[PDB]
Design a protein around this ligand. Sequence first.
Ligand code: HEM
Ligand code: HEM
Lengths: 679, 681
Amino acid sequence: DARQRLKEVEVDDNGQFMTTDFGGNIEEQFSLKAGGRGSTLLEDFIFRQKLQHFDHERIPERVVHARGAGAHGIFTSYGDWSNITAASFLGAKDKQTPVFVRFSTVAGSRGSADTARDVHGFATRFYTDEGNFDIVGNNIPVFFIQDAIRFPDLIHSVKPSPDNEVPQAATAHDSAWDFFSSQPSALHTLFWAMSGNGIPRSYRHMDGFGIHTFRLVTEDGKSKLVKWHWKTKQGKAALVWEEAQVLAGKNADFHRQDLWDAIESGNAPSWELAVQLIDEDKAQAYGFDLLDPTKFLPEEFAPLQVLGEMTLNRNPMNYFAETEQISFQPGHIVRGVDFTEDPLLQGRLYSYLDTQLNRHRGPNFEQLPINRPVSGVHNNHRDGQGQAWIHKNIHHYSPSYLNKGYPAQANQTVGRGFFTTPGRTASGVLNRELSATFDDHYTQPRLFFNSLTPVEQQFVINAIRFEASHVTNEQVKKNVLEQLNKISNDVAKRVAVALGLEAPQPDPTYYHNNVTRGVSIFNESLPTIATLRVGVLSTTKGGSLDKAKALKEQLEKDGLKVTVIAEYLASGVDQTYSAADATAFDAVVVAEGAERVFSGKGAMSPLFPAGRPSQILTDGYRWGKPVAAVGSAKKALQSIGVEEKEAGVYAGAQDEVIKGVEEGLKVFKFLERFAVDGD
Amino acid sequence: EVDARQRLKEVEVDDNGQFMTTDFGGNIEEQFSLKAGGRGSTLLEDFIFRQKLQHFDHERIPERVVHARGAGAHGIFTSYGDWSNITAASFLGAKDKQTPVFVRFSTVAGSRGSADTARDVHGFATRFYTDEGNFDIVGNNIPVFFIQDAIRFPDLIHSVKPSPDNEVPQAATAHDSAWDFFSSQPSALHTLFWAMSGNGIPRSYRHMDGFGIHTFRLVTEDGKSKLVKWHWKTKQGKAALVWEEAQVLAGKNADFHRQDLWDAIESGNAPSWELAVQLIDEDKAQAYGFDLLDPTKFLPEEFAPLQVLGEMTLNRNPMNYFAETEQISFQPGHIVRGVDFTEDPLLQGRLYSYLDTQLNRHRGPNFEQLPINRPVSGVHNNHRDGQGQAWIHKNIHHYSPSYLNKGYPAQANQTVGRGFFTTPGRTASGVLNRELSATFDDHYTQPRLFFNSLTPVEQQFVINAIRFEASHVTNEQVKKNVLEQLNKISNDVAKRVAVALGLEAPQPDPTYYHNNVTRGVSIFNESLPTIATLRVGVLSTTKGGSLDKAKALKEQLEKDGLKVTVIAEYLASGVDQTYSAADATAFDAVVVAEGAERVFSGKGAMSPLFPAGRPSQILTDGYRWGKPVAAVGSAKKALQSIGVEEKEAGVYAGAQDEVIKGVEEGLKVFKFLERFAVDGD
Ligand code: HEM
Ligand code: HEM
């Protein structure tokens, strides 16, 4: 068990009388008053100690990635990688290292919607026997900016307007689009955010990326450039913006519940840890600088090499103490790994340590159960707000005769200490400039777009069309279209149409037809299901419930959790029609003999809002979800204009519906149900 | 005539025409990090980077423990006359006396980023910048609170807020913990009925009635007191959404109420509220069938008519949400001479709590020195030092009594220096105890008086809310416990909810059953006194010259006071919003322009510009949500594609004379309750 180290700090209050924070049994339900109908007394210590705790419960949210969720896990190494890295969690076969991952959005505040369109976070803590190792990544391999100094500018621009604080968890506003049109480096991550990567189905159906180039140092000192990758065993799956908008309102904790449910149900999510190895001498050899966070390395130039697997088997016991309080830092490095001269990475090392003081009100944030390592801490650090420990060592300085030299210095040769790569050199003038090798901002965005399916590319343009239509400034819209035209003239002309402006001037400078693998979401098929969310639209009258229960049993057999929807909570009913919605499910199936409730008199029930069952079916189909009807249920599809056999849509008997709807999920989303330009 | 934000001028910072500087002055370049070479590592000696990033890393302060999600506006309070006969207050001390105000509206369970249109109790908190100190009426949009003793506040909040294990759900009461508390604490049943009604999901902050909840005292110069109940009556009228609309709006626009207020002030149509009071004699505190020290019960208008004292209008929007709205620290303990507290156990514990919490949110005691918190009256006290002391105090003898400071600052009381004083008649009698009065024992009469005072359809919205919320409880015993409590209020309410849950509800308990009705509790009975600031959506098309006909409809409507948005495939000559960007939740009236029927049927519906079947959905949504729908000329085919009658109540068909005047009529009604199914058919 990964949570074993937290068992000593775990409190049970069952079978116990109410006490104050300083001990002693009490009754915290009545205030001390001066008489029967009298004023409350200052001498009521019980009231004050209870309310003081409550009044001071909240800590500041993270400056970015405020909205998110975590889970505990176990990382297992596939073999001894001592040849490539001196890391401890990697230099052994089948070595089990405890982990904790916190996935998140960006612009969104603490209460923002899980299904908002943003870059997603993928922060992973490795509780190594040689210290805490963090890979604070994102679901997109590229970042918006090239210099960390520009981070406040990017965040201030994407986040709500400073005058009214509108909008929440969105980039559809003047300020955000002014920055992208003024900082062309931001164009690659935009294309990724405008794609399926911006609105994924779940945290489990996400690929993770360390973004930066790092170094892997061997015992001897030989280094190799490295790129961290987290490949999902569940496969990449994404929603559609029209679905995503409804889900943000119907269930703002969509991803948060998706993860929680998976772990509890037994189907724990997995990720393979892959790397891209690059020689120090081939840092600019691939047509771009590897110190550039706006560019990613294609799989064709460097194949991915799997090092191990990380699975999340335990959910937290207290969201605050664990998920909210966890303080990640990319500066949480161990012997075997080292930084690169990536200007974005360089500034992050400072920022993450600094911010911790605001969020936690002191320096002992690493003493918190969720942050503390398993390796042990022996240093000269003393005092500070909320000191949890009592240091036996009175000679808290170095060098020293009195402490016989303890704690001792460790480096490369002795005590397995951390060391910077010996080959690393500083050369040239001290300056506040950026390398000329960082000047290309249009080639890489087009490589991604050219590597997506025709309907996927539309989704990218249908996100930009949506977002840009919110810009009130006419000049910002033109500035955006000028930048988009530099990537692709096709992309620019398609967006231009929705905006009412006409500015097509093909600039063939960065135009190319090159395609890269592993960037598409829907192109590959779903491996296991294991997804799942199947909604069964049934009714309380006509014995449809009994037929729906039979479908529920047979479908769950392949490792699923099917929810039966009816007018009220009968014998086999899990959700009602007023509580249920199409956003909650991936597959919508209408049970046999489900009325007359789709268009007849049965549609007008005081139990659910007018025309609800019909809406769940309508929504599913338009969102590309595989829809199904058993026997008589064909009239449900006909009431809106849906043909018997087309894409995912399958009719017939009981077993005839089960087989096919399962195949639909492998495709997940039916792209043929979406209008592409030129038709 | 005057700017309500005049006092914040002193602190405004213009950066137009200025070069980038550090926090300690000096012109700088904050766009490139200092590196050791061309492709080198960043240097620690880069003070520019560190000072820029340090400020950014320390931008966030903790959100409010409750009422985290909300938005404010500056305003001017005007008195209708000289109320010296009823109160010694300065702001009520003269006719047409203008007192600067600042109101913050909010939810409760929702966090900083939560949706504005969620089902919660709404906050309504007013700061009066009196020439006699800051006076706060920290109230809600419901006249009654859930609990009777302030000591139980953490219990109520912990129960309604997200589960501690997973932090699910956000801004909702549809979960085991919240419904276990209501079934275990029957005092919570009145506010529940209010939260389950239209009061729980209002149309806007401007279409809300505000209540001070507690009973207070109004002290005259002489010392004579009168029990009082604060009320804020909206000049805009009470208007509420429907749950099915509210759920879609939370996703489509989570800043719905935040924008609604912002737009109103900018457009010129500033919101107004009349300040009304309920006067009660000290001796008649238990005379009305309930204790007036009870926050779970309200006083009916039939026993005590409302008396208007003045009017408050919000004419100025903030310049910086953080510095103003986020940083404002309200306290019901912000009292002035003329007003006094009552022995209300909920009020008593609030006075402590609100002052305490500021130390967490602001990390020090000088939170009152912040521009938004500072009074206009002037500050003279021996308070010194403290985190972030903004002032240089001139008096070196910071104590009392003192010979050296000549007795300054001097003590003020009732007779000298117009100081605050507690009501002289106020007495303490009896044993010191941890109990509650027997007069607080009734928790079922008042919930039933509210329910009996709602229209038949309104009553269904209460029923359905409970049906929706309770269906989320996973525990079978909690659902039974809830139905047992509901049965104590009304057997009809209990049996209707029971149906949705699958479990029957025994057994009629006629103890607190009555057919009494009270006025001014219904949201949907009375029609809106004005139609301004009401959004209307015009569904038009780029083909067939429909745009030109839509612009004509937009012109005649905008001159009435309404805010008109023309929806089409792309942003043409007169297009404000596209079909992919627009939704029915954004508007109060949905009108289909002549020649727009083309995007309802055939290939017109299948466009790469908007999602499949969008125009139809906006029209479908508007009708099912009870919004007045309209069609000009041939646009009758649009209504026919879903099954809507042109002569139905709320539906308008004809010309660009009949629609324009016919729609604006339906807006006065706001929501057509006839389209909603009631039990018994
Ligand atoms: C490749 C670029 C970046 C990635 C992948 C990234 C990713 C993340 C993630 C995933 C988190 C939240 C971690 C968690 O779940 O607790 C985070 C937090 C944060 N990031 Fe970034 N970040 C990037 C760049 C930056 C930069 C350039 C800065 C500033 C120099 C920065 C400053 C922060 C800060 C201050 C926080 C809050 C952390 C905390 O309160 O613990 N990040 N970042
Ligand atoms: C009639 C009952 C109550 C009403 C009407 C009420 C109303 C409000 C409102 C409207 C706010 C937010 C003010 C703003 O816009 O900034 C607020 C905040 C708060 N309330 Fe209540 N409240 C009530 C009872 C309580 C009780 C019983 C307690 C605890 C004893 C309490 C503790 C707080 C605290 C700690 C905050 C946060 C204030 C801040 O951070 O400035 N409230 N309340």
